[PDB]
Design a protein around this nucleic acid. Structure first.
Lengths: 342, 208, 335
DNA sequence: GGAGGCCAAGATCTCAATTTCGTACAAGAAATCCTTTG
DNA sequence: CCCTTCGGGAGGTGCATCCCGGTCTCGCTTGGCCTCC
RNA sequence: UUAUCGGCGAGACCGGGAUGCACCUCCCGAAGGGUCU
């Protein structure tokens, strides 16, 4: 049981994006800003932690193996416990006096749950935020516009029947008329929305009410439309993401990591390297990363750390350096005494 | 820039060239050195004393010019016992808040309405002294003709033009913070503004 | 059941451009920048993805075939769902109970929607952005100006009738008058902009509407003819753009469909736009590499090279994927 | 044997419930502007 | 020494947790009992 | 300022779990041309 600190850097082979509910606002998709609005953005440690937790869950699924039809022995509740730490069965207390010492045996027999904790049990693995090293390493990506296929290319018209061509005609006519109507609704409702700024606090409620009914009017105008519900022609708003090649300093810590727990974490990193995807917008191939981490241990009471080795994840492969990390991976792979159905 | 003072953006007086302005953080005491170079200097002003107590309402110069106890020879406040007559009207605490959202510089409609009403209640020539030109704009837009000629100080307009125009035809004169030490004379020495209306105290913005 | 990563390069046969709405400002058309104004422009993954999705859709309709008159059996909603990913009928929703475990059967029956996904259905294909390898390799192309043909070459005077000659002279004189008027009004607009707020914006809108009305007070020639053309930013010919795609958890059928779509795209290797200037033509080579999860290194399944001379595919894995997609008759795209 | 210290015991009872500064300003000059233009 | 285009259009939805556990005191005087001198 | 004088103090980890993601080609058109060993 020793602490392992993975200090390293993540290069972004492709743009790296995430949508945190608090971070996003009415303006559009934005990364959390590591502070106030204009502060430098960071990739959440939450998305990284969830990605690696799912990778570890798949590692454990493969290690236990699948029956001939390809299903896992684990119950669905066990899948949720392992990868998301939700006990749907409906019993996991925290201060259970009888669970005071059951944590040790549970951790020994369930390396994944020890590594990634659960409700009531601390998680030995702590994945920090990824913060860009330099400046201007982020920007708006993926912005575009959904267009009508038959209007961009006319060769698709010879595929449609006359009745279907009429359907497209009605679709476009409904689009135009409902869009001008919705634009008028939008302009009048933002006309009174800017009066919110200088309004009596009592009148602010009335302004909010009027905005809400105008939004309901927008919804009704979209509902009365028959051919389509949402407009085919539309500008797709861009999302904020780290640039390609962006170098983000990253920090992780497995506190009091056993050999098997650290081995499981390294196996999770290895399996993650197969699909090195962090965050969202899989379309546009966002999330591909090339991450290298130096694993350093620190025996308590010592004045300096010891660099056990380096974990380098590249599109060309996963390089494990240092005999200690190989030993941890081998110990995890060779320890058959794990019970994840706890 | 960072070490001391204020940063900003400048447009040169001639040729209108973009520039990035900074503040010299050690020339603040050089002016005091320059004053002390004279055999005996006297800084006198009509508003130099923040308070009525000399030895506590004068530290703004004591610190701004860097004057320590070496250069505090006398600190005295002299005001006339009786000079003119002053009636005071004030907005009480229940008066509407000036800014509904001062961070975005949004004047509350209630306060603007009350200011417009009170200005419309005047019956003689008056000098309204706003703080911002934006506030001048908003009160001018909300306010209309109230039987009293209105006059406005456009942003950047030299106060001489507005004051000359308003002198011959007195009445409501809205002036922004551009006028700091210029008062409208009545062109023969007589007072031509029975009312001096400070719409809002010219609070300085936060300097983060 | 493997995740295929296509890593490679796109060489630019003719300049490559894209008009991203957020990227382009009133200053001028600019390629979407990889962070800030001064970074290296990239070609969006969105345009590549849309082009290859339309290619896959054409592959699917061709494989399904047409009737005697030459009509695709699909309907408009099906066409849009396949290539556009938009449910005309509105019968799509995310996180819907009941769709649970319909993903596998739907993907097997509809490989295209499995690849590119739909609203609420994750798309297996992720089409990265094209990043230039070296510095430069981008610049302003197009440019030039539309001009009055009739003042450049004069043989057309022998074609036009006298009434049409009078019409042309009236057009030229009235466009000169409109040009001077618009130059004056735009100089006034620029001076007002240099002056500096909501009232100013309203005045600007009113002045723009007056400009539009002046352009509407034009009997014949409302749009100016002898007008400069704003250049569009693009990547230079021969620009090497590093490109990364990935089919996540792709079946043999899905990957085969993707390779077929790649071939059909290579039929007309156009990306982005300015097709008038033949922009978008590209030759691309991609090493397809799989990575069995748990393994330390990936294995190269093969290579696909797109070139005007042809499409080369090497590695029996890619041939097997294409043959599996073609042979599998159990696809149902009319879902 | 006396004279310091440590501990226990001694009557019942007093009244009351809390919440977030300030908003926008800019004059007559050595200047460096400058240096022109050439 | 020309002359700077049109506008299209701007999302649908999810779901918003559980639980601990809230202290001693003492505002004085006196004698009984313990060891100390 | 109806007197004089009097630190209220000492101890405590609040922590434990979560991928926010899922779909969109922004394209549509133009000769910048002509004058001088």
């Amino acid at each position: 049981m020793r602490t392992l600190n993975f200090n390293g850097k993540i290069s972004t082979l492709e743009p790296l994006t995430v949508t945190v509910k608090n971070a996003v606002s009415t303006s559009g998709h934005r990364l959390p800003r590591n502070g106030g609005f204009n502060a430098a953005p960071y990739f959440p440690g939450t998305s990284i932690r969830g990605t690696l937790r799912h990778a570890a869950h798949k590692v454990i699924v493969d290690r236990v193996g699948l029956n001939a039809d390809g299903k896992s022995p684990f119950d669905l509740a066990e899948h949720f416990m392992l990868a998301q730490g939700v006990d749907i069965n409906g019993e996991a207390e925290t201060f259970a006096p009888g669970e005071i010492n059951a944590g040790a045996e549970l951790r020994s027999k369930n390396p994944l749950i020890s590594l990634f904790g659960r409700w009531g049990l601390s998680g030995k693995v702590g994945i920090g935020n990824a913060i860009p090293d330099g400046d201007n390493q982020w920007g708006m990506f993926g912005g575009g516009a959904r267009s009508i296929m038959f209007q961009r290319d006319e060769s698709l018209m010879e595929f449609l029947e006359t009745d279907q061509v009429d359907r497209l005609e009605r679709l476009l006519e409904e689009q135009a008329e409902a869009s001008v109507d919705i634009s008028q609704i939008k302009t009048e409702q933002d006309a009174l929305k800017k009066a919110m700024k200088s309004a009596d606090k009592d009148t602010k409620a009335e302004l909010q009410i009027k905005v809400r009914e105008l939004d309901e009017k927008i919804q009704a105008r979209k509902d009365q439309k028959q051919e389509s519900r949402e407009s085919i022609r539309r500008p797709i708003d861009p999302y904020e993401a780290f640039i390609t090649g962006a170098e983000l300093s990253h920090r992780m810590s497995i506190k009091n990591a056993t050999d098997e727990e650290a081995g499981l974490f390294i196996s999770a990193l290895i399996r993650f390297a197969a699909e090195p995807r962090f965050g969202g917008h899989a379309n546009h191939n966002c999330g591909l990363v090339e991450a290298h981490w130096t694993v350093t241990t620190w025996k308590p009471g010592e004045l300096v750390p010891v660099t056990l080795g380096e974990i380098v994840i590249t599109p060309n492969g996963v390089e494990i350096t240092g005999d200690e990390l190989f030993a941890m991976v081998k110990a995890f792979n060779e320890n058959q005494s794990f019970d994840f159905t706890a | 820039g960072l070490s001391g003072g204020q940063k900003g953006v400048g447009v040169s007086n001639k040729r209108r060239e973009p520039a990035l302005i900074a503040v010299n953080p050690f020339i603040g005491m050089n002016v005091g050195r320059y004053c002390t170079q004279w055999r005996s200097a006297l800084l006198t002003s009509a508003t130099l004393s923040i308070t009525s107590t000399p030895e506590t309402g004068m530290e703004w110069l004591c610190k701004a010019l860097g004057l320590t106890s070496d250069t505090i020879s006398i600190r005295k406040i002299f005001s006339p016992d009786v000079y003119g007559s002053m009636k005071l009207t004030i907005a009480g605490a229940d008066f509407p808040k000036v800014f509904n959202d001062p961070k975005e510089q949004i004047f509350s409609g209630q306060w603007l309405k009350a200011v417009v009403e009170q200005l419309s209640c005047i019956q003689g020539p008056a000098l309204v002294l706003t703080a911002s030109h934006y506030e001048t704009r908003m009160i001018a837009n909300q306010l209309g003709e109230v039987s009293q000629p209105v006059y406005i100080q456009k942003a950047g307009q030299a106060l001489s033009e507005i004051i000359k125009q308003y002198q011959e035809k007195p009445g409501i004169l809205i002036s922004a913070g551009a006028s700091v030490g210029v008062s409208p004379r009545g062109e023969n020495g007589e007072q031509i503004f029975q009312d001096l209306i400070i719409t809002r105290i010219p609070f300085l913005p936060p300097d983060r």
